[PDB]
């Protein structure tokens, strides 16, 4: 499992793979690991699948409940605090074998400068959170390879297309180096999933663009 | 790791993959797991790499030493006994984490009927050996999937080409179902390795034929 | 124990065996492992017998109770959520030796296209659920052999008869490869049990058809 | 695994099944578990396969070595003592998971009365031996069912044919009650193996007679 | 301890022995292990004596309480459910050394066909219940020998006398093979206890008939 | 297991039962537990069967070897010392589950008074020996009941017949109170075994006398 | 600790850092971790310092001893075998906390093509060795970051200068990502150490070139 | 992690580093570890990050809550007591791996002499607090080196500038001796953070002054 997120001038882009394994046996081929929490926020959780889906559905319900009750949406710090509390509450279950690690991406509409409005937040198993300032982050078992690839490929990002290409390349490198991460499937036609957040909101990326980018990358590497 | 062996009218064919892993991290991409022990015998070992290479080199040296000392090669039962003794001697090291499991294929020149001269022998961790009579066998972590594929694909085998195609298809299915088994690599150009034993001896299969068969299988599955 | 389920154009078919064992001793010969929960849903549970019957009776009562209380039946997602909650609640008892794993098959009447209305859902020990998209699934100790047989026999399915024949063949292969699965009994006259769900509801398959199919398969293999 | 032995006026008959299992997985279908040690003695060992074959080959070599050295064969008590010593020496390996339990059948040529010359000897894990006086014995995991069947079917034995039929029926009952024992296979054509010892020596029973007896028993039970 | 139950055309018959032991020391010689719960149901419990008597007295009180409260007796399925709940509630005490295993026999007055109205129900340590369809069942430490004897002696049962004789013979065989089961005592005059249930209700069998049957069986075996 | 020995004016008498058990399962019905070591000494061993037979055969061989080497038999104290050394050497194997406890009876030919020449010696698990002076001793799991019966029945002993009757009665009481001790079998015709040692040597008692005594005792108790 | 090795047309280059730590405390600032074993071979060991120096001095002495004894140097395979034996012999000490992992670089003078004569060999804790075919390798705790940097920077290598620059950059990245690896020190003037092997032999790189390259890299990153 | 605090005539100065590590891997480069609790008090916590932020936010909220409720701020002893209670309450979580150790600096406005109004308070894991009287204190894993540096550099402190320079030098020495402490970064431009408290309140130090001081110190050491 590997989920990447990065910033471009105008917003953020988040991408994730589709492989689910049970030890060394492949169990799932088209799992979706990226969710749209609200109009300007996306979350990606790694670890036990059931805990991840439960956390995602609970977080979405809590945000919607607050928005309906108070008539106004929460600020970014409030959402970070709620997610940190949810993560901290699972420490006892995080031990003994039910662990979930989230990653958050968002667009701040209250920021003075619209260009620097994209935010990426990472979390730890004890509930501590950190706001990234380097422009990219990765979570999962193949996060080190993806981070090392982005460290070299980040100079090419100029807009959304460049960032999406860099994210796909990082996922490809992570799948190349890790056996628990699923690479592109050309026999079946399964590709990673991406979400792009900008001033107009959060939109899912169509699969044709990702397929074209993956084919171009595969041709380049060959 | 998955090594398959099967019989065709005239001889035997053995095939193996090339992936080496350390947990969930990929460590080796072009490992060779099939050896030619002598003019009419091939061996394939699964498990710890160092133990496998040590076992193979030791077995070859022992066979050559006996042949040079006595002026006549050993019979098939003698080779089986020597391999079983070698396996039985590693029981203590097989426990605690140094395990090697071999599979043997051969052609008997003393058999009355040259058609039914191919032999396949399997071994267990305690040193017990079994001579196969169904026509195929597989060893490794993905052996169950390969065996289940051969159970359905064995009716098509008529000669060496048919058997080689069936072996490649079984390896492909094993790699599809298991993450510790390496599939064909078209970006890099790495394919499984095969050895064919018949009345003229044991010969390594050139990589072009295996590449053609793998491409045909991939096109068929797509 | 092995329970299989598969999709055909028009609906779904689920099949199960009849053997119950206590270690290596045979305890039961005509156990029924497939239940009709409601007019359009079937469930099959593997594991401890008492837990399975308790889970089945409880699930049926809960569905009927909701239908009577609200005057309208639940949707498919609601039933999946209820089953997942029931499975998740038994985690503590799943450890230490009281484990039950269910498999769900159903027909969605709210789907726009009646042809693609059959659904198959699998579950894990932690309460996570997955909706199948390949067309078949198996649960139990012999599920791997049945899945590997269906992977090769799925191209022949065209209607209900073809699917039933494929399911019986998969159960036969699972019983051939596993000793904890009961095969057809011709001395006594005991055969697996099947349920077919289509637009008209869920119907139990009469035993004469299954006996004829099993006899044909046995004759073919001989 | 189940091996039976019984006495008839004129000699002894020993029979055994052909199933080999690894837990709940079937590993072997045509294993031979009955050996002819010398001209008037047969042995059947249950437990770990490798230990059983090693014990059998060692016992045969020791008997032949003594016969060649001294120019005269050993008496029955000497053979019993040698087998008991061999069993007693494996106590340490019998613990921790390498256990072999033998059963011996023989014809005494030094007995005054040729009619009462058949002997059956059983052994325990500590090396103690017992000479049977009831006329039948069984070893293995399904020995209780076979013994209970012979207790009722022993009144019909008059000659070799009657004893062979009773032995086949006892093996059939043991396979009916135990899942680790292999029953007759009519799809493949595999049947238990039998050895008959009389004043002329020890002879293997041809498979046609056993197939006919098994078919008759199956027809009777149906 | 061994309790047997079997079906004959017209009803059911249940029988039990009288030995109570504390390790290898004999503690009781005339213990009664079969109870008449109501007008058409009998129960026999094996295991710890105190738990068995407590379970029996509690079950009888519960059935009588329901009958008095509702003015109508429970159906057979309700009684089975109550007994299963009672057994399931003792799982924690079943572990660590307070185990009780029941067996139930009854006559259904609501059945359409009076001939096939006898029912035999067995239970497991986790609370799972099974309805027998072969015609006989045994519980206790000597149940295997009794079952194997009934498997051969069931063809002679035609009416109540035949069934009672078969039950006494099965108990005799169980006592012959097991040392924890008490056989007939001719020095003291103590014999097993039996209960016969038919359309007129459940009646205890007088001891003279059982003594005559036991004497006849002993004479036959001598 | 219970072995009794007692003194009468003129010599000694030793008796033993014939039951062999494996837990609560009966394994042997006609085991012989009393041996004649030499012309004036008898030994009876209780515990593990194999250890007992090994000890007996070894003791006999050692006594014969000394007699042949030195040309003169050992004295009684020397035999006691040899037996005590043999018992002491098995202490390590006596722990962990291989225990053998002997009892010795003999006639001293060097005693001044021929009337008081019978000797009974008992041993403990550490190798300590004691010479009895009360006139009787018992070994085994039912030794307490036999000793308590002899304490009351010893006043009737006058000669060999009286002592034999008392020994049979003590064995009968031990079998009555203990389930691991075999009583007289009238269906099969198996009775305890006795040895009588006097000035003329040690003689085995014929079975007819023991059968008559057992029948008389059974009639008296009835 | 991080040691890198890579191939360029004409030979090989190996580089290593200088930090030694004891937990989180810095103990050494100018440790040398790269040795020249002979005229055409270099070795770099990571792990416990004392074991590394002992292994290096022993390997050099063994190679020199063989060269002096036989009058001819060993071949490359012989050196690999000797190093593998030395590593395998320390398995017991490798456990419990004395671990040393080597990496070997060399130039083969017996190769037909002088361009492709550079060899890089890696080893595992059990004694297994692998010959690299991708052109670079890294060992130590920061090996993953260095490998990921070389995977992107390898396309620039054309000659010795390019390879040395790439090696220094990889070491810089490893020190950036790992706290147990020492980076360039400009206050003190301490830089990594490098060895270059080509057709003329193995030569140590002067520190001025490495200082210039490190200053250029630092200026580029700033 | 290292946080230093010291006194100068007129007030106090507190400084801290910016490195966050996870074992031997660097995780954070610009972490802020010094907080302004109120107008005259600063706190610095070392240990687990999440616990530190939670403690800081809770302490600030508690102080503000008391000030708003009572209309008057707490005295210094009251704040010390509240912090000690908060530390004491985490003892159970301090064990097993969630430890936080604070350090407090403040200016007392109720002191008679404004010159000697700066206070430094240290705490232990059990909740005990100590008021420093030597003029400086350090907390963290590199506190010993910083304390030993201040012991020699304290004679130069005359005003705020001297104290700030001494604090930066102590942090530099701690980073030199400890690998878990971050030193000045000139490639990226990250420097430690400082807070100065005097009669006018608590003010954050601008980064330009700290950068100038760090550059001067680095030039001096070179
Ligand atoms: C979203 C999620 C797929 C993340 C990934 N985790 C897993 O796949 C872990 N796997 C299971 O939880 C699991 C899945 C099934 Cl089907 C059965 C049993 C188990 Cl144990 B990842 O690589 O980190
Ligand atoms: C021939 C052999 C490759 C067989 C296969 N086994 C392994 O790959 C096991 N792996 C290692 O031994 C190993 C390899 C390295 Cl590079 C480092 C550490 C370890 Cl621990 B297989 O899949 O069964
Ligand atoms: C529906 C159910 C039969 C499923 C199957 N499970 C079992 O048979 C497990 N067996 C028992 O639970 C059990 C049965 C009895 Cl009669 C007594 C004791 C025990 Cl322990 B399967 O193969 O997975
Ligand atoms: C002669 C012998 C077949 C007797 C029987 N024992 C076994 O089958 C036990 N099985 C193995 O030893 C064994 C066989 C293989 Cl192929 C692989 C691993 C193992 Cl662990 B029996 O039922 O008692
Ligand atoms: C109805 C009952 C007699 C059943 C049987 N169980 C027992 O006899 C077990 N025995 C005791 O519980 C017991 C009896 C006494 Cl007197 C003292 C101590 C103990 Cl521990 B059976 O064979 O299964
Ligand atoms: C002479 C001897 C029969 C004495 C008696 N001991 C035993 O019977 C103990 N039993 C066995 O040793 C034994 C017998 C067999 Cl057939 C199989 C396994 C075992 Cl474990 B006694 O009651 O003290
Ligand atoms: C060549 C060698 C420096 C390699 C490196 N290993 C170490 O530094 C380990 N450290 C010690 O062994 C050690 C050093 C001292 Cl001064 C005192 C105690 C210890 Cl325990 B590396 O990073 O892998
Ligand atoms: C304020 C705080 C940074 C103090 C320092 N502590 C730590 O850095 C400890 N580290 C973590 O807690 C931690 C950080 C992350 Cl990103 C992930 C996992 C863990 Cl486990 B120090 O050196 O004492």
Numbering used by the authors:
A (entry chain Q), B (entry chain b), C (entry chain R), D (entry chain a), E (entry chain S), F (entry chain Z), ...: 1 to 222
Text taken from the publication that reported this structure:
These rings assemble to form three interconnected compartments: two antechambers formed by α7-β7 and a central degradation chamber. Stacked β-rings enclose the degradation chamber where active sites containing the catalytic triad of βT1, βD17, and βK33 proteolyze substrates.
Consistent with the described inhibition mechanism for this class of proteasome inhibitors, the boronic acid group of ixazomib is located within 1.5 Å of the catalytic oxygen atom of βT1 to allow the formation of a covalent bond. In addition, ixazomib binding is mediated by hydrogen bonding with the backbone and surrounding polar side chains. These included the catalytic D17 (residues β6-25), the N terminus of switch helix I (residues β49-54), the C terminus of switch helix II (residues βF87-Q98), and the remainder belonged to regions in the immediate vicinity of the catalytic triad and the intra-ring β-β interface.
